[PDB]
Structure formats: structure tokens, C-alpha cells
Amino acid sequence: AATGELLEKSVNTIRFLAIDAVEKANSGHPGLPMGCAPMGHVLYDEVMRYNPKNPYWFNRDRFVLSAGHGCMLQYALLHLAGYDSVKEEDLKQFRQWGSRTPGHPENFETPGVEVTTGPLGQGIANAVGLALAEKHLAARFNKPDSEIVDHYTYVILGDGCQMEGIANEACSLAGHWGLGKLIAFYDDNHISIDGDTEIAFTEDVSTRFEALGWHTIWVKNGNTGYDDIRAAIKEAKAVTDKPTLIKVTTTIGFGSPNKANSYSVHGSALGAKEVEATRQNLGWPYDTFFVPEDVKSHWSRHTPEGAALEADWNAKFAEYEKKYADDAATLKSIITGELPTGWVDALPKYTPESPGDATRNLSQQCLNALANVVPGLIGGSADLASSNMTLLKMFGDFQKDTAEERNVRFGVREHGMGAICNGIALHSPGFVPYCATFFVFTDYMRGAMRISALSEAGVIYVMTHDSIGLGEDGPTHQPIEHLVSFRAMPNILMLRPADGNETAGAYKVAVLNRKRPSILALSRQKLPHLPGTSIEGVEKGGYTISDNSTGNKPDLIVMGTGSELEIAAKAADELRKEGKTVRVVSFVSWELFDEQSDEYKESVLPAAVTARISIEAGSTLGWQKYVGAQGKAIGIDKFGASAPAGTIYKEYGITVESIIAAAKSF
Amino acid sequence: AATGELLEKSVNTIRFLAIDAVEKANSGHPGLPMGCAPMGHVLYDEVMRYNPKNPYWFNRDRFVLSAGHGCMLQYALLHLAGYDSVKEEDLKQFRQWGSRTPGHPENFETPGVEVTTGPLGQGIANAVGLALAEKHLAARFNKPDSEIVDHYTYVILGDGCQMEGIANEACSLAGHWGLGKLIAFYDDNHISIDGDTEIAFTEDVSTRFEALGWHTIWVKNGNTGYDDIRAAIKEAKAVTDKPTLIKVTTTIGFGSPNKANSYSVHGSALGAKEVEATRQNLGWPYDTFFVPEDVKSHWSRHTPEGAALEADWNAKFAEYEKKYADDAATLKSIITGELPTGWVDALPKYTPESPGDATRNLSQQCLNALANVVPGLIGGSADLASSNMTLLKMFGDFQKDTAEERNVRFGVREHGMGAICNGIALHSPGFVPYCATFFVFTDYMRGAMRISALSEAGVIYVMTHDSIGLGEDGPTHQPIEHLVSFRAMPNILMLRPADGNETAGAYKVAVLNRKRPSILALSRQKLPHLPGTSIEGVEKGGYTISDNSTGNKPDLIVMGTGSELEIAAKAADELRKEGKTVRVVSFVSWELFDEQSDEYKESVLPAAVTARISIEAGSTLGWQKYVGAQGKAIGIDKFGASAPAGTIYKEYGITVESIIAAAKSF
Numbered sequence A, B: 001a002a003t004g005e006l007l008e009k010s011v012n013t014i015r016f017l018a019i020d021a022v023e024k025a026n027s028g029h030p031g032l033p034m035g036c037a038p039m040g041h042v043l044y045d046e047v048m049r050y051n052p053k054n055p056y057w058f059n060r061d062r063f064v065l066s067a068g069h070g071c072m073l074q075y076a077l078l079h080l081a082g083y084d085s086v087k088e089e090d091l092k093q094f095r096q097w098g099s100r101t102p103g104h105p106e107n108f109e110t111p112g113v114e115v116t117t118g119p120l121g122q123g124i125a126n127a128v129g130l131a132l133a134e135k136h137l138a139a140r141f142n143k144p145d146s147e148i149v150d151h152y153t154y155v156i157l158g159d160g161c162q163m164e165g166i167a168n169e170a171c172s173l174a175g176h177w178g179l180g181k182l183i184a185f186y187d188d189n190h191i192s193i194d195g196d197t198e199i200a201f202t203e204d205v206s207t208r209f210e211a212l213g214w215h216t217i218w219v220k221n222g223n224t225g226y227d228d229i230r231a232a233i234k235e236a237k238a239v240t241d242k243p244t245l246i247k248v249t250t251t252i253g254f255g256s257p258n259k260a261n262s263y264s265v266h267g268s269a270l271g272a273k274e275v276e277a278t279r280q281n282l283g284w285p286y287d288t289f290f291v292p293e294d295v296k297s298h299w300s301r302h303t304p305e306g307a308a309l310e311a312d313w314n315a316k317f318a319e320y321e322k323k324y325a326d327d328a329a330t331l332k333s334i335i336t337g338e339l340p341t342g343w344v345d346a347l348p349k350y351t352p353e354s355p356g357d358a359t360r361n362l363s364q365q366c367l368n369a370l371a372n373v374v375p376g377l378i379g380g381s382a383d384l385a386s387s388n389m390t391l392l393k394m395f396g397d398f399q400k401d402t403a404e405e406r407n408v409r410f411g412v413r414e415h416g417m418g419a420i421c422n423g424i425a426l427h428s429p430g431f432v433p434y435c436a437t438f439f440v441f442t443d444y445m446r447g448a449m450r451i452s453a454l455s456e457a458g459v460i461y462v463m464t465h466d467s468i469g470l471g472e473d474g475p476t477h478q479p480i481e482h483l484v485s486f487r488a489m490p491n492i493l494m495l496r497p498a499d500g501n502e503t504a505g506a507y508k509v510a511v512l513n514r515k516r517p518s519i520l521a522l523s524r525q526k527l528p529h530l531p532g533t534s535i536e537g538v539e540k541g542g543y544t545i546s547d548n549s550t551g552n553k554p555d556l557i558v559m560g561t562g563s564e565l566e567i568a569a570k571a572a573d574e575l576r577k578e579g580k581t582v583r584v585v586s587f588v589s590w591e592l593f594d595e596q597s598d599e600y601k602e603s604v605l606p607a608a609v610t611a612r613i614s615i616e617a618g619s620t621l622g623w624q625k626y627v628g629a630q631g632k633a634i635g636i637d638k639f640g641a642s643a644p645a646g647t648i649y650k651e652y653g654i655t656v657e658s659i660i661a662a663a664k665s666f
């Protein structure tokens, strides 16, 4: 452990790397890194177990910077630790086009960064998911003579995260689950962007956390109380049954003679004059982006020590593999991301003779089928297990005493639920987390969902009661703009299966896409199994289910999704009687369709056929890209109503007669 | 005050109206009404001040049912109290097409219901807004010899609301603001939809609330402790500097011999057999929807008493208007919703000679100009006042000691902020609340924004840093799908002004729409003032700013919004050099354009002109409805990047050259 002048120099190396990176970019946040350098140093140099040359080592401790704006703190540490992702030149490319050092930490750009933060509150919620994953894995695979999974989850958060409701949702669950290895550092600096926190934040954070079930500790001198910080971490790991909140009081911009403790240092370059003044104040003769040789030498030990920690763990796993071969084989799946051979064969198959059912119920069949073949499937609903139909029948509930169970009960915390799943998904490539609620409530958790898409987290979102079909609950519960709001979001699949085969198909696609989240819009009401639907069609996004035309030139093309496909089919039969040739197209997913070749698209929507009709219980916006200019889109562009589903469909014109009336307009 | 058997009969009348209503619709929630009947009775019959024949009386106490699913509780009370909006027949039309008794309370459907609830957590946050409104109004208009504004805000919430992050955000704010007249009843019944709360909710709620700055009380017997409830309310009104949380332990479905204290009674009809058993158990001979004559008689006093309470206040207001004529005139504007004559003339006007500026700064000028002529304008930013540019320079900050101030500092709580504004908007029609954050974080508060649209709350959402133009913060901060995600939402205006004249126009529209929320997408970067822009044009949604064609037949039509209009204008100049006639159209708002006449539309986008180009730094989805099948839409359909804005615009092709390249494809 560093001490004396070496400790001071290392801590200041971190502060100045942050100051110089920001100054060069003339953009960024120097405040947090300056005040948090002391705890950052203790954490990466003395406490955390990791291998800088292998950021993927399974049993590594995890670090999460929830106050993402302070990313230079993390980049400085990754650089000093020896990670290949952050070299000297990368620091000099901070916030510049295409660099490994973007304005906010992004896991997909920088190996060593575990999750994507920046939107406040996500980080701490992700850490709860990471700690859940570790506890689950340890409870499920550890043996009396072999403790193979054992790592801590460290997270740094500021006042902004503490004010966000998502943070309180996640921390409430963490306390309830007894996540002893989750250790959070709260940067108590009394400053946010509007200035002093007394302006809008005067609650007793520590007492709130105690109420949530957390163990609490307060380090009053966060700027120079290095031993206090060490001691706090030690006591934190001693308390094994409760997550620990370590409040560390620091002064933002510490070291800056004229900008410390002010909102001015939160997010803008110090400036040439103040940088010079700060260098004199801290006694930093060294120049731009300099790492003193003795500091560099001290930090270099992490490479050989890191290699040895992993070698030690590998030996342990080899011995585990020979005693518990089966458990080892299963754990390897979660560690490598390689799904078991033939998992696809476990998916249900249906025929139009199978009894009709709501896609939400068919979803449950697929979930229980998959639970047997995919060891990493884990998840649950936000207090709606009996409506969402998300219980894995063969398992109990994940709880502090039964962490090995696979049904996770989130309570009424949608947003926290989403971020926790992002944490699970990014813990190990073999996890396949799924979470659920009513489709309309994705609005509550849209922040975490957008992060899923941007961070390439393969979370499967099971959303039921997807339309006015839910009936009586009314407009506050009926989605309308939701499908298009997600078709417009990049890198996320918006699947809306019509029946059993499409539902199984949606799940095949969802499991196969480990780098892109999937949303399944499922119905509350029973739907018939349609002839023409198939697992293979779904992978295509938009495909033909029935066609009585020839030469790829039907008189009419009718397209639909989910519960409205049936209506499109019934209308097509009707129109065929009158002698017209009609093609019925299922658009389970716009995303997958757009990804197909031009040949494929032409084969489904021939450019020559202009008479096109679409039907879907939701906004009509955007359908023009498929129905064309002379085409007609039947939908709902107003809020719903409180009444029996049947009545709403009739009153809103989501009927076979509307398709027919529209057909005779061509 | 009722007592003995009369009190028991009154309380049971409430239980049975709820039971019968749910049984007849065979849909609904009987549990909460059955368990909460006692406190509802005490609240509406003994505590609240209101005039059942005038649901709009300004100084009435406000009640909010945050646990919206239990609406039958409120319908039963409104019925008994004498409100004209809930007759016996309305109770029999519960959850049926077009009834005044929808499945969740909607203020727009039922006079007497203050806000729209159903999505959990919104109600308690709305109550915080209602209480803020009363506190602000009292501090601002009360005189030492005249206390004209004085009312309490009562709210009932359940475990579901207590778990939602939005509730913690608003209650954190309520404690910080010392809202002594906010009195919340927490229905502590240990049941949620997944069953017993021990499955996912074991935090110490009361201690969390004390940490937030709330006064706490616990009534252990909420089923029959009528005097304990009364006493608790008495103590709550005595504590004047802190909001009070009264935890009332009850048993859900109280009275039902076989379904009480179980999840089965939460949200489904009891069923014929259990209804009979419940009638026997409580000793309720009376049949379907019956109100005993003695109960009816007891409740009828509220009509003459209510009339007298309001008459009293009216006299008091008349004497107030005589002494303080000026203050009275200003207060009346907030009360009646009638805005001062000529407020429109206060808006700034600009010309292309005016210096260029970011629309976020131009927004501030408009807000400050408006503060002077619109008494009900109040609001602020979620810890981003210095970036959103929302401070009303002539005022201080709203705080427990300075409640008369008009700048509200919400801290980093977007969702709570939105719900609180809905509460203010719905307190009185003259309030014009505005709130702000970066456009990308609308995702955090989308739940409340949707409710603004559905409940017809004229909230003005000031959203800055609307695109990749914000630069270096990166993809986590850059909107992409947001504009279309709101153009798809019913009853909400999605305004994206290009310059000063358009920004002033956007505010004119926003202020005039008191029944529909408005969102303003504002830029971070400086934009020039363009020739052709005007306040009037904005009211049209889509209008021409420059045209060199004749006979309404240009060779090319180029449309754009906000920061991209400038690019479209520059490209048109180039093309006009080559001898083409080009029409430049501004689409400040899709919504406003679609509401215009067919003649008007044809005059801007002549059906005969097929060469159309649109440019907007956002998703291209939906632009097809204006650019046509042969038109081209230039936009961004992927996430952003961390880099200087200029570089991102070039790399993504949001440039004049892209417009020109596309123009030569026609």
C-alpha cells in the first residue's frame, strides 16, 4: 500500500490527469474526479480484485461509477492500473469523435467499464443487479469445500443519484435482499448543478438508507482521511447481511484555490489561469498528462498481481470442475455465453387446431420451456406475476435466504427493475434476464430501457395488456403511442406476436439477440392460432401468412400485428369470396423486416402493388412507410376508454368492416 | 358526527356500494374500498370542507385517491355527499362505455375528482403540487386581517404508491418545503397484487418518511378505530410545519368472511356466493345499491352546510376585494383562468438583424416577459436552471419561508417534478406551470407527461439540448426518437422553434392551450434569426417562410424544424441560384398543421408537387406523411456520439450538401 509522499503523488496524479484531459477537450467534469481521487485510489489500488490484462475475468470485483459525468476518475484509474483500453493517447482524445474515452462511461466503447452510466440513478440500480447476480450464482453453485464465486460490487454515486426515485427503488430492493457484498460510496459534497444542495435537498440520506435496511457509515474527512476510508471499507465487508452505504464528505474541485466547493467546478474546464494556480497549490511541477515514474512503478504491480489472482481462481475452478462436473458445465454456460445445444427444440409449436389462448399465457409456456434448457434465464414481474404470467413454475422466489431461486419479485418498481436487469445482463454473457409489467408502464421505466438498447444489453421485456383489448381499466392503462415510440428507438426489437407460433418465434429471436434488447407486446385477451404463422417467419419481421395471388401481384395487401392479425385474416377471406386476390402479411417486427434484403422485401411488398391496408390497435404514425401514399392505415390516434374490450373495438373501428370499407376505395 | 349504529351503517353503506358496483360490472377493485371505508367516511363526513353542489369552489379542501384502482371508495363518497356527477344510475354504469364512473378516477369525466390517477404514485405527487399551490397562494395573497386562501390537501395511498420512486421524489420535496397542510393516509394492509408485501417490501416506511422531514403517526386499528383516526387527524392539523403521514393499518376486503386479507379480493368481483356471505357477516339485509334512509338523511346535511361554507368564504372574498383591489384582481385571474388583456403584446419580437442566440436563451426572455403579465406562471428546472435558462430574474425561490416566490427548484427529480406540475395545473385554471430538464430525460418523467395529455393539464414542458447539437456529453444525453415519440402521443403539442420569433410563437400557443400540454424542444447552440418566421406562422404549425415559385407549384419543397431550418434555408438559396423555384417550410408543430383546413394544407404542400425533402436532427419515422412516397427524409435513425457538435452534424450528413445531393435525385 502506498504511503506518505507516494500516496499524495498518486492521488494527485489522478486529479491532474482529470484536470488536463478536461482542459484539453475544453469540455468535461473536473469537480468529482478532484474530490473523489482519494477514494478512487484506495479502491483500485488496495481493495478491488481484478486483472488489468483481462477485463473479462469472471470472478473480478465490479466497479460502477453511477455519477457518470465524473468519468475521468475512472479513465485515470483504468490507465494507471494498466488496462489496454486506456493508453496515454486515449486520455488525450477525451470527448473526441470515436475515442475510447467518451463524455460518459460506455461499456460498449471501453473494456474495463462494466455498464453505461450518465443518466443519473442508473448506475446504483445496475450495481444492485450485479450484486444480485453474484449472490444468486454463489448460492446456486458454491459448495461447502469450494467457494468459486465470490466478488464484491463497488459503486460511487453523488447527490444527483440520491435524489432520483430509481435509486430509492433499487436500494429498497437491495436492503430487502440482504446484498452484503454491495458497497456504495456516496460522494457527500453538498453541491449539485443548481449550487448548494440546501436549495432542494435537505433530507437525512443516512437515516433513509437505514430504513431501507442498509448498514451505514460516515467518513467525515473524505479529502485526506485515507485511513478513515480504508477502515470504513474494512468494516463494510465485515457486515455480511446488509448492503453498506459509506457517506464520504469531500469538497468538489479539491485543490483548486478559487473554484473548489463551488458549482463552477462541476462541469467545465478550470481554465489556463486556474490550472496554473491549482498546480502551484498542490505542488504539481509536472506538466501536461504526466505520470511520475515512482507512481507509475507503484501501479505496475497490478499486472503481475492481477495475473496471479486470476491464476489462483482458475486453479480453484479446475478443481471444482472435476468434483462437480455437472454444476461446472452449467456455470460455464453462464460464464461463456454459449447456450446449450438444442435449446431451440424446447420451444412449443402449435397448429390452428390447438385451443386459442392469450399470447400472455403462451408466453408463460415458452418461459417455462426455456427455463429447463437455458441456465441463465432469470427474472420476474413488478407485482403483476398473475397478470403478466411470468412465474417459472419449477422454482421458488429469489430472497436473501433462497438466493438460488430464479423467480425475482420486483414489487411496484418498474424503473428500478429495468436497471437491475441491465446489471444482470452485463454481469456475464450467459445471463438472459427478463422483466415484466403492463405495456403501458414502460413509460415509468423508459430510461433504463433506452440504456438497454444503447449499452447492448440483451434484456427481454415481457409487456402484457398491450392494447384497448384490456378493456375496463381504461385510458390510464391502454397503450396507444407505445409501439411506435419503440419502433423509433434505435437497437431494440418491438415484437408483437399474433399467436402461439409467433410467440415462440419472438422468444427464439429474443434469446438469440444477446446484444440487443427485445420487447414483446402480449395480449390480455384470447386469440386464435392462425394458419400460416411460423417460428421462421418471425425471424423475417414481416412475412406472408396467406396468399391467393400469382406472379407476386395481388389486388390487395393487408397487413397486421398481434391481436389485429386475426381481423386482417377474416377480412381477407371475405374479400377473396368476391373474387379478389389478397395477400395477408404479418409484421411481428418492423426491425427485422427492415434488415432483410431488397429481394425479400420486394417479395413481400411488391413495389407494383399500391392497394395496401394496415390494421393495428395503436397509433397510425409511421405505417406510411409500408402502406405507401395511396395506402390506408387503420388504427387509434386518440386515448382509450373505460369499457368492455368488444365495445371499444367496435366504437373505434378496429373491425373487419373497416378493412372491407377501405378495400372498396381502391 | 355520526355515532353508534348510524356510524356502522354509514361505513357499511360505503362498503356495499363498492361491492355491488363491482359485482354488477364484474370488473373492479372491492378490496381497498372495503378496508378504507372507515377513513373515507371520517374524511368526507367529518373533516373536509366542500360544497357538493359546487365542485369548483376555490377554497375547498382537496382530496386525492392515489391508489386509483379503489375509485369506488370515492364514487361512493361523492354519491353520498350529494355531488351531481354521481347519481345512483352512474354507480350502476361503473366501468361501462361513456359513464361518469370509469375504472380509474378521471377529473375530465367526473366533477368532484381533482386529478386523474391509476398509474401508481402520480396521486401523492399531484397532492404535493396541490399543497404547494395553496401554500404559494396563501403566502402571496393573505393579509393580516384577511386569510382568504386556506385549505388542506388530503391523499390516500397504498403500498403500490409507496414503492414507486416518484412518490419518494415528491415526498422528499414536500418535507423540504414544509407543506404542513398536506395530510397523507397510507393504507397499510400488507397486501399487493403478488400477495403479502413481505415478498418484496420490508422497508420501514415510517422511518423513511421521518428522514424526509415528515411528521408521522400510526393508527393500529383502521378497521374500527374511528376515534383513533379522528385523533390522528387532529394531531396532524396541529403540526403546521411538516407534512403528515398517517399510517392506517387495515385489512383489505374487510367484512368478506372468505376473501379478506388475501390478494383475491384486491381486483376482482367477490362473486354471488361470497357477496351473500359478506352481507350475512356484516348484517346487511338491504339489497343491491341500497342507501338506508337514516344514512341518506344524515349525509344530506352537507348540501345546506356546504352552501353555507361557500357563502361564508364569498362574503370574506368580497370584503377582501374591497380593501385590496389590486391583489384581488390578480388572484381572480388565477382563480377564473381569465388571463389579463394584452398579455400577448409582452412577447419579444425579432428580425434577421437581431443577434443570433440559442432558443433556450430566447425561451428565458419569453418566460421573463410573461412573468409580468401572467400571474399564474410558476415553475422551474430539475437542477438545471443554469442550462435550461428557466429563472424568472425578478423573483426568488419558493421555499418553506418564502412560499410567495415563483421560481421552483425541483432538484434532480424529473418524474416527481412532472406530477407536481399536474397538481398545480389542476389546482386552479389560471395557473400556468412550467418545468424543465434536458429533452432526453423526458424518458424519466414520461409517466407524468402522458397523464398531462390525458387529464388535459396545460403544463408547459421546457426541454433544452434537443439534439446531437449538444455535443460532447454523448449518446446517453442526445435525443433521437423523442420528437416522434411525442408526435405520436395524443393531446400534446410537440413544438420545435427555429429562432426567436418562433420561440415567442411557441409560448403564445402554449399559454393559450390551457387544456393541452405543450413541449418545447430548445437548442443548446446558437441559431440565427431567419427571415420569414413569425408568431402567427407558429399557430399554423406548418407554414412557408420563403418562396420564389408561382402558381403554388415550386420545383422543390424543403421542410425542417428547429436548428435544422437554418440548413434548409441555406440549401434553398444554393438551389435557387441554379434557377429552381424552392419553397421553404417550417414545421414548428405537426399537431397544429394537421388541425388546419384542407385548403390551408394544399396551400403549403400542394398535392401536385412530388419533390419533397425534410431535414431534422432526429428519427425519420413518420416524416413520410409529409414528404410523400417519392420524397426524401434526412435524419438520424441511430444513437449519437461523444464529440463536438459540428463534427457530429457532418458525420451524420445533417448538412446543406445532403439536401442538395437529394434535390438532384428528382
Ligand SMILES: Cc1ncc(C[n+]2csc(CCOP(=O)(O)OP(=O)(O)O)c2C)c(N)n1
Binding pocket: A031, A032, A067, A069, A070, A118, A119, A120, A157, A158, A159, A160, A161, A189, A191, A192, A193, A252, A266, B382, B383, B384, B412, B437, B441, B444
Ligand atoms: C436523469 C438525469 N437528469 C439530469 C441530468 C443532468 N445532470 C448531470 S450531473 C447533474 C448534477 C448532479 O450533481 P451530483 O450528482 O451531486 O454531482 P457533483 O456535482 O457533485 O459532481 C445533473 C442535474 C442527468 N445526467 N441525468
Ligand SMILES: Cc1ncc(C[n+]2csc(CCOP(=O)(O)OP(=O)(O)O)c2C)c(N)n1
Binding pocket: A382, A383, A384, A412, A441, A444, B031, B032, B067, B069, B070, B118, B119, B120, B121, B157, B158, B159, B160, B161, B189, B191, B192, B193, B252, B266
Ligand atoms: C405505475 C403502475 N405500475 C403497476 C400498476 C398495476 N397495479 C395496479 S394496483 C397494483 C397493486 C398495488 O397494491 P396496493 O397499492 O398495495 O393496493 P391494494 O392491493 O392494497 O388495494 C398494481 C401493481 C399500476 N396501476 N401503475
Ligand SMILES: [Mg+2]
Binding pocket: A158, A159, A160, A187, A188, A189, A190, A191, A192
Ligand atoms: Mg454533489
Ligand SMILES: [Mg+2]
Binding pocket: B158, B159, B160, B187, B188, B189, B190, B191, B192
Ligand atoms: Mg396494499
